[PDB]
Coordinates of C-alpha atoms and ligand atoms in Angstrom, one line a residue:
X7 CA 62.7 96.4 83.8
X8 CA 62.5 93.6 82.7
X9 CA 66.3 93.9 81.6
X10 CA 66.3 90.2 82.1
X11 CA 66.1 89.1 78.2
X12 CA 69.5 91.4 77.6
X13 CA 72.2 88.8 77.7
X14 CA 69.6 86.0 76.7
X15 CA 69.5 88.5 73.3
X16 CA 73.3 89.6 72.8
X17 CA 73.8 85.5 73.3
X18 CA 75.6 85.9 75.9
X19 CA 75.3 83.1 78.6
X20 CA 74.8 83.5 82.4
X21 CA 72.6 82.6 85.3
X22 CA 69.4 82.8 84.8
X23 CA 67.7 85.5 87.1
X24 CA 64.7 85.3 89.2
X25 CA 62.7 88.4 89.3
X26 CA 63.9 91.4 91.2
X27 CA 67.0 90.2 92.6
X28 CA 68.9 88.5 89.5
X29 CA 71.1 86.4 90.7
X30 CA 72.2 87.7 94.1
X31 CA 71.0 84.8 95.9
X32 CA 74.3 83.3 94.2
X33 CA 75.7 86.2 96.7
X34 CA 75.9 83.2 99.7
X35 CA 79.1 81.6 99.2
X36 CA 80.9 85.3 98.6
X37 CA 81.2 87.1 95.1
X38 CA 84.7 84.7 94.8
X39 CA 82.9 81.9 94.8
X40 CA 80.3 82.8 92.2
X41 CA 83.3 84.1 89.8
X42 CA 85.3 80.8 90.1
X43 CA 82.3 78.9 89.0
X44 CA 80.8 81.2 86.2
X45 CA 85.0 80.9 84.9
X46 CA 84.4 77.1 84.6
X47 CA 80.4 76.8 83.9
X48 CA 80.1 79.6 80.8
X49 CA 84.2 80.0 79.9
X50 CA 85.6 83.8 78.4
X51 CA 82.7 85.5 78.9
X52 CA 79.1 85.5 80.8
X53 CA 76.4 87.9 82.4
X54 CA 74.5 88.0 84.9
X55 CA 72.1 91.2 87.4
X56 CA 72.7 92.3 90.1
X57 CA 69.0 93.3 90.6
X58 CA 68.3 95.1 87.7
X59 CA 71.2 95.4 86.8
X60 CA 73.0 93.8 84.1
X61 CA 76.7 92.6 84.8
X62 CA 79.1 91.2 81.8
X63 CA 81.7 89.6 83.1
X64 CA 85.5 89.2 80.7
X65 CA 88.4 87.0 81.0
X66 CA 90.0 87.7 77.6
X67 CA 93.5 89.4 78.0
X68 CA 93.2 91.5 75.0
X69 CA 89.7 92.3 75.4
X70 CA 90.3 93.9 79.2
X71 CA 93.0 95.9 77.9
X72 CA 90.9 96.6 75.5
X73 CA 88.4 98.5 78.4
X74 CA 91.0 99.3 81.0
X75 CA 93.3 101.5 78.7
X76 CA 92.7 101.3 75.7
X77 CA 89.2 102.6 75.6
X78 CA 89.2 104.3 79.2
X79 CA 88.9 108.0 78.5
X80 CA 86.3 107.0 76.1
X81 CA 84.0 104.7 77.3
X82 CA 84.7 103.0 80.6
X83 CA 85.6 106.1 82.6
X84 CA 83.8 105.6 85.7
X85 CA 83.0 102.5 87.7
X86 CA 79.4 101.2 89.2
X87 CA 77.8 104.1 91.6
X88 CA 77.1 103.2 95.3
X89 CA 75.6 105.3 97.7
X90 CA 74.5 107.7 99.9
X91 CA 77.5 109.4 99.9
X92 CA 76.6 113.0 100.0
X93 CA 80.1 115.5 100.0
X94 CA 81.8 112.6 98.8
X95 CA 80.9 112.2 95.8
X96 CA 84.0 115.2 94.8
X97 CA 86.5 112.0 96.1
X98 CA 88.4 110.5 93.6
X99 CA 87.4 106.9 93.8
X100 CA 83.9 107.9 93.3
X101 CA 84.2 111.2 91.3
X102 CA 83.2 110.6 87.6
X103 CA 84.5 111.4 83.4
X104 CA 85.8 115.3 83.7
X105 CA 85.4 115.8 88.0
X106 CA 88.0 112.4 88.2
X107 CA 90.5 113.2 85.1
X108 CA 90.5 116.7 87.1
X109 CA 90.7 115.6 90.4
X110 CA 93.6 112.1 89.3
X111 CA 96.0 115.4 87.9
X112 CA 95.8 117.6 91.2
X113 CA 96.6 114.3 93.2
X114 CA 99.1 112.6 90.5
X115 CA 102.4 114.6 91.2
X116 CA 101.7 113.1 95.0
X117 CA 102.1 109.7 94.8
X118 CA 105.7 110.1 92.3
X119 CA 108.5 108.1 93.4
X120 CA 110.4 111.4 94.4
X121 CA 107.6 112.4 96.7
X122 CA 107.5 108.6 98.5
X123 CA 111.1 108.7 99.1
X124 CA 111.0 112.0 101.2
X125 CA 108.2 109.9 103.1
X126 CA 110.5 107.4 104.2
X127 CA 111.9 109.0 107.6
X128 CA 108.9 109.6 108.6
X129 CA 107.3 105.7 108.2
X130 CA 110.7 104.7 109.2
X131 CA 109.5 105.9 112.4
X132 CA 106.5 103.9 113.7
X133 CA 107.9 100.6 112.9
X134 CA 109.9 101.1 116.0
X135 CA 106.9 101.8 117.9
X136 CA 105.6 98.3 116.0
X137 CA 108.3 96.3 117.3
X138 CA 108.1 97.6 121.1
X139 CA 104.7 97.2 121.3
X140 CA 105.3 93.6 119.8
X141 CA 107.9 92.5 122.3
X142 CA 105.5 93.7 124.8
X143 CA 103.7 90.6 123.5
X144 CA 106.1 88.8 122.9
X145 CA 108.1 88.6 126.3
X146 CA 104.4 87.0 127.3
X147 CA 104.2 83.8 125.8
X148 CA 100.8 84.6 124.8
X149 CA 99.6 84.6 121.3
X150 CA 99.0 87.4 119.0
X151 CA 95.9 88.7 117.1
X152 CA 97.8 90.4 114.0
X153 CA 94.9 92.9 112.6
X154 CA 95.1 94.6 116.0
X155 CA 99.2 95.3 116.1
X156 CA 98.9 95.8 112.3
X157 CA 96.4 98.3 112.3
X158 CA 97.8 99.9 114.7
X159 CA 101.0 100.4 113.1
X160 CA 98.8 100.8 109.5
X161 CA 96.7 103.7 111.6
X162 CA 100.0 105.0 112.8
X163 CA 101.3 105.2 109.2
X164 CA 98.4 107.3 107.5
X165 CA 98.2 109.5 110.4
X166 CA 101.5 110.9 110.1
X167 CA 101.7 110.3 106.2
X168 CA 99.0 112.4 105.9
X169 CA 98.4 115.3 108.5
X170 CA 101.3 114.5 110.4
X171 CA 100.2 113.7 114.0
X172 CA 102.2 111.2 116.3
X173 CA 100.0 108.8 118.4
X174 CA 100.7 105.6 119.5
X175 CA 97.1 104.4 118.8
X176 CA 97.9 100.8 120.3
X177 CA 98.3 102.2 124.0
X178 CA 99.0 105.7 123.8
X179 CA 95.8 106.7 124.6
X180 CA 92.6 108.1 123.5
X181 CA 94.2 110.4 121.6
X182 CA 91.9 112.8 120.1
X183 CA 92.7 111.5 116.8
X184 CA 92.4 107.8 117.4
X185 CA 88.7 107.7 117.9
X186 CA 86.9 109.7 115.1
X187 CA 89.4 106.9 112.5
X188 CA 88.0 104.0 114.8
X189 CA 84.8 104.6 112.7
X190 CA 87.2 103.9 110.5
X198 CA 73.4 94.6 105.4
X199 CA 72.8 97.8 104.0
X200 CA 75.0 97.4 101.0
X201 CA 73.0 94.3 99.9
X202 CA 69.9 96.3 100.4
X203 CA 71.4 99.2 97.7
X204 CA 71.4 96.5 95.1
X205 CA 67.1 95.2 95.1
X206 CA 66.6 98.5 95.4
X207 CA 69.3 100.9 93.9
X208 CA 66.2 103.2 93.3
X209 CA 66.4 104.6 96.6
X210 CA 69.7 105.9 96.3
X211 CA 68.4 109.2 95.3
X212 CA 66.0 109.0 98.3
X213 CA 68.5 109.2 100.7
X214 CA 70.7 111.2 99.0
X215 CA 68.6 114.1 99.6
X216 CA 68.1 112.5 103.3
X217 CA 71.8 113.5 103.5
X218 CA 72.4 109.7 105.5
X219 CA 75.9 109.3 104.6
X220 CA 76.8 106.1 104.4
X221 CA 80.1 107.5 106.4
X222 CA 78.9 108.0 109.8
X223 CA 77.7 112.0 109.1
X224 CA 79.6 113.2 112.3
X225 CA 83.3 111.6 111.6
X226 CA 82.9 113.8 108.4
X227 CA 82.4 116.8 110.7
X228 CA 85.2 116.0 112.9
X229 CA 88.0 116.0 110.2
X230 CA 86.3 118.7 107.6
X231 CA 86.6 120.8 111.1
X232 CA 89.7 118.8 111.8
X233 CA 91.2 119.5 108.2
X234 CA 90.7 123.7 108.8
X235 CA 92.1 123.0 111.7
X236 CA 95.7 121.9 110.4
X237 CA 94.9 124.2 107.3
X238 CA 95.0 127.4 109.5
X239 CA 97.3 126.5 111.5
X240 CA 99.8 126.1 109.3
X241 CA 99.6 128.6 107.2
X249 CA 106.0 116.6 104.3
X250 CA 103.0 114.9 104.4
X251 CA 99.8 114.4 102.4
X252 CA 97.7 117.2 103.2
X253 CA 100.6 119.4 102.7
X254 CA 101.4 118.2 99.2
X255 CA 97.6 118.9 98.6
X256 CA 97.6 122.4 100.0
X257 CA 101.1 122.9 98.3
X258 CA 98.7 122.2 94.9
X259 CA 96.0 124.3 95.8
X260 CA 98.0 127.6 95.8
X266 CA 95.0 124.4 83.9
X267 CA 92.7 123.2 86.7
X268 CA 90.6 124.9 89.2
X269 CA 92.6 124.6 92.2
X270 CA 91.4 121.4 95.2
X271 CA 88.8 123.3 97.1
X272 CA 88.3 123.0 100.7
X273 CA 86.4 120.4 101.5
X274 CA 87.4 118.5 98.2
X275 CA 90.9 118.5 100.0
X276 CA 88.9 116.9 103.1
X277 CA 87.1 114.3 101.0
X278 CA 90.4 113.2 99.6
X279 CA 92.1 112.7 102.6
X280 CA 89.4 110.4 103.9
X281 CA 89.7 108.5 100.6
X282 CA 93.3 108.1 101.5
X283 CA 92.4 106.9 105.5
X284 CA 90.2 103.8 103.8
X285 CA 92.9 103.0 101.7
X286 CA 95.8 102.6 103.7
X287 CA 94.0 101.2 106.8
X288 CA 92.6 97.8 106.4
X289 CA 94.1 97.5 103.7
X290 CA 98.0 98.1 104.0
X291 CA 96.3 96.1 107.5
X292 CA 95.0 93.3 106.0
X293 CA 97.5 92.3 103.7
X294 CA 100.7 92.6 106.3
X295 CA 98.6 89.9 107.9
X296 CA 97.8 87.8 104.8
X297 CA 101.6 88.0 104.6
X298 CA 102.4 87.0 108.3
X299 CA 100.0 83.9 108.1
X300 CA 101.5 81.9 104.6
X301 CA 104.9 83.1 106.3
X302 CA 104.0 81.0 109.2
X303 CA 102.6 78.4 107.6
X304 CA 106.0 78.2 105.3
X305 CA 108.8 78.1 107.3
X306 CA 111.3 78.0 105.1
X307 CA 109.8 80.7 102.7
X308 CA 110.3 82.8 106.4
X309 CA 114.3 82.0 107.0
X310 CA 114.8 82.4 103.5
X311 CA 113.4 86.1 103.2
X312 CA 115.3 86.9 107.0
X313 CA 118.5 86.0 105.6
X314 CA 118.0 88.2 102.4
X315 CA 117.0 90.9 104.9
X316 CA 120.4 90.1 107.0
X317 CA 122.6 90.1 104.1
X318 CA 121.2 93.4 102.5
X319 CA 120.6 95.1 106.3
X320 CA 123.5 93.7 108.4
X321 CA 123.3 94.1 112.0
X322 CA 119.2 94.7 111.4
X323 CA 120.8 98.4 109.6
X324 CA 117.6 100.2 109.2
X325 CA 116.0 100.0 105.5
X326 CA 116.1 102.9 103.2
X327 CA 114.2 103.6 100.2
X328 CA 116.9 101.8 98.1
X329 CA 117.5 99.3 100.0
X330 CA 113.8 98.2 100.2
X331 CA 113.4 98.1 96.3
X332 CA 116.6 96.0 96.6
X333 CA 115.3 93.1 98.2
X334 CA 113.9 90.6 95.5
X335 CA 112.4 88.2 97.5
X336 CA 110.7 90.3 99.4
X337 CA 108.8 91.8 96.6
X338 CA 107.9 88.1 95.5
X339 CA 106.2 87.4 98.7
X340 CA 105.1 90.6 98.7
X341 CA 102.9 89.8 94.7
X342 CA 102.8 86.0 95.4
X343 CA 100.6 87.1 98.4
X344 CA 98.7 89.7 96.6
X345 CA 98.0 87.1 93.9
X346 CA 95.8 84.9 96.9
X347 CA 94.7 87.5 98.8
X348 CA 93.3 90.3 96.2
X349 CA 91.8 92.9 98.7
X350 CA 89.8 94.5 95.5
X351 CA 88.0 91.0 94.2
X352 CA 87.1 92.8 91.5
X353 CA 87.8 95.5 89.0
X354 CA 84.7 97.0 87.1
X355 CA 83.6 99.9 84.8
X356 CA 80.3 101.7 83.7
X357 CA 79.9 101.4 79.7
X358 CA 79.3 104.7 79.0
X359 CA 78.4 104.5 75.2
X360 CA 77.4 101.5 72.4
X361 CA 80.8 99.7 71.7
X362 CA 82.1 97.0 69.8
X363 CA 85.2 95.4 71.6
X364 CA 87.0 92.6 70.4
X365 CA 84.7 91.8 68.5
X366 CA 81.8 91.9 70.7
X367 CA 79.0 94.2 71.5
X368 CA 78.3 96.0 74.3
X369 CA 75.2 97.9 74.5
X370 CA 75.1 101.1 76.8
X371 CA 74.5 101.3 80.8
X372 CA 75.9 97.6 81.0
X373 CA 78.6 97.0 84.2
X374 CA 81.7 94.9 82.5
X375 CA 83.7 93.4 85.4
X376 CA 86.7 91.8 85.3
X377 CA 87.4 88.8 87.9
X378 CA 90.2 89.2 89.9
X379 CA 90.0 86.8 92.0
X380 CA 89.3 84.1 89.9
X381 CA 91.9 84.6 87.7
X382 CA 94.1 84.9 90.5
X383 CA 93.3 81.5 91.0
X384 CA 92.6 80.2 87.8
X385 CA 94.5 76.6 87.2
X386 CA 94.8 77.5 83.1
X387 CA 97.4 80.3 84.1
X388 CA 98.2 79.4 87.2
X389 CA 100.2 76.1 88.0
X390 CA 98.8 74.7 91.5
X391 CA 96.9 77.9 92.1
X392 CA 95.8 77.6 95.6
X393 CA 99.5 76.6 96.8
X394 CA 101.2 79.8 98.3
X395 CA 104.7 79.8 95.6
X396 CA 106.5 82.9 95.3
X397 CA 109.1 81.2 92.8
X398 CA 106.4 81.9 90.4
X399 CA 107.8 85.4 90.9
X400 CA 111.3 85.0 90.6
X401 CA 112.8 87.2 87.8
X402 CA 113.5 84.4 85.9
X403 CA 109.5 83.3 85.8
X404 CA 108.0 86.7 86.6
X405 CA 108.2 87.6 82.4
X406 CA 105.7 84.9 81.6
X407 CA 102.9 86.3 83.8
X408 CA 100.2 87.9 81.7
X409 CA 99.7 91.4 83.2
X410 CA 96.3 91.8 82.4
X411 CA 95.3 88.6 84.5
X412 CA 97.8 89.5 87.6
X413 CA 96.3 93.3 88.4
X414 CA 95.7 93.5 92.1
X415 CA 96.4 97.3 91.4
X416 CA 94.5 97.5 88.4
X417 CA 95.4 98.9 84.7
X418 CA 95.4 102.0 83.1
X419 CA 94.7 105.5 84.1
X420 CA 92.6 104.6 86.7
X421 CA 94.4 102.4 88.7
X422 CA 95.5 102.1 92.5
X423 CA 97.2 105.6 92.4
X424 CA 98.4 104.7 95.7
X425 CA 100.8 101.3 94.5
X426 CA 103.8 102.4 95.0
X427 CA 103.3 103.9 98.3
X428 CA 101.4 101.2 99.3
X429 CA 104.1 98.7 98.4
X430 CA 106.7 100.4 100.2
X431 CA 105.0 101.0 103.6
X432 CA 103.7 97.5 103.6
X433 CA 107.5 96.4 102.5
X434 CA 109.1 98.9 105.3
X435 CA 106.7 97.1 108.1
X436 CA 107.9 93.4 107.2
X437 CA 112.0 94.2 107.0
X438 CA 111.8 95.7 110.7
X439 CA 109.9 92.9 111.7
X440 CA 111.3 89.8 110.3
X441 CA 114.2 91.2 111.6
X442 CA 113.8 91.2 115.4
X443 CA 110.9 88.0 115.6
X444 CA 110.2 84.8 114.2
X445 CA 106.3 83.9 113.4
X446 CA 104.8 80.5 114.6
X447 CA 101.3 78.8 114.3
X448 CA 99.5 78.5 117.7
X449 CA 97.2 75.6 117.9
X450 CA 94.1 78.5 117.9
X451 CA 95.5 79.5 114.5
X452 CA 93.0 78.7 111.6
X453 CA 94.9 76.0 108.8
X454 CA 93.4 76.5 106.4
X455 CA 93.0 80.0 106.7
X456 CA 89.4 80.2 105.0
X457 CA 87.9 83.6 103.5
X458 CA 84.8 85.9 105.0
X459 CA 81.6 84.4 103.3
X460 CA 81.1 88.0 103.4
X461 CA 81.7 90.4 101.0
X462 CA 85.3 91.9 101.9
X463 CA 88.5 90.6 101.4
X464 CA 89.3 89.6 104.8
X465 CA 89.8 86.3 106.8
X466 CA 87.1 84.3 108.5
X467 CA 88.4 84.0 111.7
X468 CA 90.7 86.9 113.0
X469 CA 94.8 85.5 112.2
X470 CA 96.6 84.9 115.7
X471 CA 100.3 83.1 115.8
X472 CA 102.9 82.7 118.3
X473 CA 105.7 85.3 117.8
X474 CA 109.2 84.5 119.5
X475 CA 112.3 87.1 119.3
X476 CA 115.5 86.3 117.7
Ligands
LIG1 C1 97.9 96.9 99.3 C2 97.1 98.0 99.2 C3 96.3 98.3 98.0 C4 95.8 97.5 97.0 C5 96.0 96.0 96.7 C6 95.1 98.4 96.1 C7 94.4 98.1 95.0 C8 93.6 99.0 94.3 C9 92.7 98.6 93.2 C10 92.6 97.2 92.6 C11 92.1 99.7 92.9 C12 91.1 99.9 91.7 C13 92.0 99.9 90.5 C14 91.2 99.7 89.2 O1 89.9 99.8 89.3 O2 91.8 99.6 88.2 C15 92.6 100.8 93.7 C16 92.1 102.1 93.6 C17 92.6 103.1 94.3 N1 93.5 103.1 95.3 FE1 94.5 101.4 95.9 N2 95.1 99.7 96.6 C18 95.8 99.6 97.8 C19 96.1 100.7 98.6 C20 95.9 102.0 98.4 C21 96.5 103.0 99.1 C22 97.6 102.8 100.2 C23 96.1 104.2 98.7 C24 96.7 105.5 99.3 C25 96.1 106.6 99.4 C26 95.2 103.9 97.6 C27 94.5 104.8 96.8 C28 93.6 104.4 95.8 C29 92.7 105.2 95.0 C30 92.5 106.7 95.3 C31 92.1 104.5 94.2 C32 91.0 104.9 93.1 C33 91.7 105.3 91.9 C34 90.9 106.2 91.0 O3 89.6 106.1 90.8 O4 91.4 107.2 90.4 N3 95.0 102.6 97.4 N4 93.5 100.3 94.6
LIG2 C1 81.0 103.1 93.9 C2 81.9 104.0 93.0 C3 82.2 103.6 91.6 C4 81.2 105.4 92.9 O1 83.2 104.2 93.8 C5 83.9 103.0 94.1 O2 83.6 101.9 93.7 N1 85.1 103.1 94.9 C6 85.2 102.2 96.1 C7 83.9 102.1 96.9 S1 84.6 101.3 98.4 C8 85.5 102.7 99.3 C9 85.7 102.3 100.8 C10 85.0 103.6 101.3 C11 84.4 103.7 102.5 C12 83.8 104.9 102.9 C13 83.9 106.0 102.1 C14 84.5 105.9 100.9 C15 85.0 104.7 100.5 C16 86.8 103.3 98.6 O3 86.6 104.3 97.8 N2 88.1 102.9 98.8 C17 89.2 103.6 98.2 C18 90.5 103.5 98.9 C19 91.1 102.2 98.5 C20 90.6 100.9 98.9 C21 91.1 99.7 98.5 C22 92.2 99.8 97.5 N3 92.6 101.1 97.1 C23 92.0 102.2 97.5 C24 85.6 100.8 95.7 C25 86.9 100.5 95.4 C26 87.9 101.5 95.8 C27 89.2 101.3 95.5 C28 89.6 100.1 94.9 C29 88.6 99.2 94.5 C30 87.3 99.4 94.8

């Protein structure tokens, strides 16, 4: 301190900072917000602190492939610490240079398209359960709250997916499984004072509830002993040029794995349902591609799914509003020259997602839901270093294509059985969390009617 003059050297512009909290006060109206008007107040590039700590944000197509693959390995390995996290630190989100390029090869060969396909059956499955426990609702003229039947569905998904139990988590009942996953301010507080990170870190506060932990690293040796299709098996099938996935690094991992397909293969199937309902049309038109590829509702298969081009349009068209990550960022670990820029060391470089998701010089009426703009004809012109809501390079969502498919799998079944209609309760325009996750302001509820 005072790393304040940095950017005000380099030349680079930026919010000025007050002391000891930068510009997080610019935190009120969401991180979005504050990207979308940086984009149009300081143009390819600015900066700005978080705190202390100095953020450069880039918008330059070459320049972030430049960092996301071109100089990964090298310089921007690891992205911004958080904490406490105590044992999970050896996860592979957070794990850092050698511990991740380990830890991304152990869990690689899990996530090929061979392995997914095998995984099918099995998330085949609890989309029946979804649709029962749907007409349950929808027999009752009574409208729906989407999270809730999503999540339980999501829930049901990773549960099998990944350790194989069979629950019903909506009704079926408190199932010893469903509870210790229901725990499924202070992160502003990390960023004044980052300095007491340490602090707690030999306090051993996790910042995951320190008993859920115990539950599934007791849980895990549980399933681990007892058996000796799913995740954990595929991860003690690696275990037996790398030291083999230790014990409670298999634990961590599959915790990792919970947070990811939970809210968000939740959030986004109802991100999905709302701009269906508010577009009719953009509805019919996807159930009749679903009727002429799956006559008779025929259940989907893994070919069929990938089959279905529509589909995937709503499916990116969505992701392009709704990007759950925000956005992408990277520690510089070393002094670089990019582009023709410096970089000195230690400095955060973040890349906007969001706001080039929405940004009106690549995108033509950006806040308008379109999925044309997706259409195999169109979807060549789309620069793929602004349209990332998976990331780029080696260290992106190493879960895509899984993701994709489960979230795909969920909407065939569906759209073919119901039809999805606003409710006067429903929020138009849907408006995001102030906040700082990707979520909706006001919980998505819609009137669902059976075909
Ligand atoms: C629609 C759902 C999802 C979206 C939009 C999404 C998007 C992302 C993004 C943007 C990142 C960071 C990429 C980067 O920094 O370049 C990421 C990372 C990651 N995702 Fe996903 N993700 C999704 C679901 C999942 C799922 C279902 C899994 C399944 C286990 C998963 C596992 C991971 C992991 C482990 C990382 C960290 C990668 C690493 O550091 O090596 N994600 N995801
Ligand atoms: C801070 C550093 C650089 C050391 O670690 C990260 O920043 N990592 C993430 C931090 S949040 C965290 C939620 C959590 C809650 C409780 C325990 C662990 C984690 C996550 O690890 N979630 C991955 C699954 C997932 C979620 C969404 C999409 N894909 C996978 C942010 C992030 C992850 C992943 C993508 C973008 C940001």
């Amino acid at each position: 301190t005072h790393s304040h003059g940095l950017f005000k050297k380099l030349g680079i512009p930026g919010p000025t900072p007050l002391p000891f909290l930068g510009n997080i006060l610019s935190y009120h109206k969401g991180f979005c917000m504050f990207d979308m008007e940086c984009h149009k107040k300081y143009g390819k590039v600015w900066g700005f602190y978080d705190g202390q700590q100095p953020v450069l944000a880039i918008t330059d197509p070459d320049m972030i492939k430049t960092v996301l693959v071109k100089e990964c390995y090298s310089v921007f390995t690891n992205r911004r610490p958080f904490g406490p996290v105590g044992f999970m630190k050896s996860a592979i989100s957070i794990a850092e240079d050698e511990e991740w390029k380990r830890l991304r090869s152990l869990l690689s060969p899990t996530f090929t398209s061979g392995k997914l396909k095998e995984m099918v059956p099995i998330i085949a499955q609890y989309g029946d359960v979804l649709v029962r426990n749907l007409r349950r609702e929808a027999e009752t003229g009574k409208p729906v709250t989407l999270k809730d039947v999503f999540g339980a569905y999501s829930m049901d998904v990773i549960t099998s997916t990944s350790f194989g139990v069979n629950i019903d988590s909506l009704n079926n009942p408190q199932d010893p499984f469903v509870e210790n996953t229901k725990k499924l301010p202070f992160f502003l507080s990390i960023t004044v004072f980052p300095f007491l990170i340490p602090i707690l870190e030999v306090l051993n506060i996790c910042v995951f509830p320190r008993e859920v932990t115990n539950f599934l690293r007791k849980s895990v040796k549980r399933m681990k002993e007892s058996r000796l299709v799913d995740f954990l098996q595929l991860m003690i099938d690696s275990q037996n040029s790398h030291k083999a996935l230790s014990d409670l690094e298999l634990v961590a991992q599959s915790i990792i794995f919970i947070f990811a397909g939970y809210e968000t293969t939740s959030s986004v199937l109802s991100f999905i349902m709302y701009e269906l309902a508010t577009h009719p049309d953009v509805q019919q038109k996807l159930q009749e591609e679903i009727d002429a590829v799956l006559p008779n509702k025929a259940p989907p298969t893994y070919d069929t799914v990938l089959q279905m081009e529509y589909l995937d349009m709503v499916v990116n068209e969505t992701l392009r509003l709704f990007p759950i990550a925000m956005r992408l960022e990277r520690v510089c670990k070393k002094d670089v020259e990019i582009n023709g820029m410096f970089i000195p060391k230690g400095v955060v470089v973040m890349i906007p997602s969001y706001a080039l998701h929405r940004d009106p010089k690549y995108w033509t009426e950006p806040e308008k839901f379109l999925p044309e703009r997706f259409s195999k004809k169109n979807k060549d012109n789309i620069d793929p270093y602004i349209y990332t809501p998976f990331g780029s390079g080696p260290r992106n969502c190493i879960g895509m294509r899984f993701a994709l498919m489960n979230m795909k799998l969920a909407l065939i079944r569906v759209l073919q059985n119901f039809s999805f209609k606003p409710c006067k309760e429903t929020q138009i325009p849907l408006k995001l969390s102030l906040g700082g996750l990707l979520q909706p302001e006001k919980p998505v509820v819609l009137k669902v009617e059976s075909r």
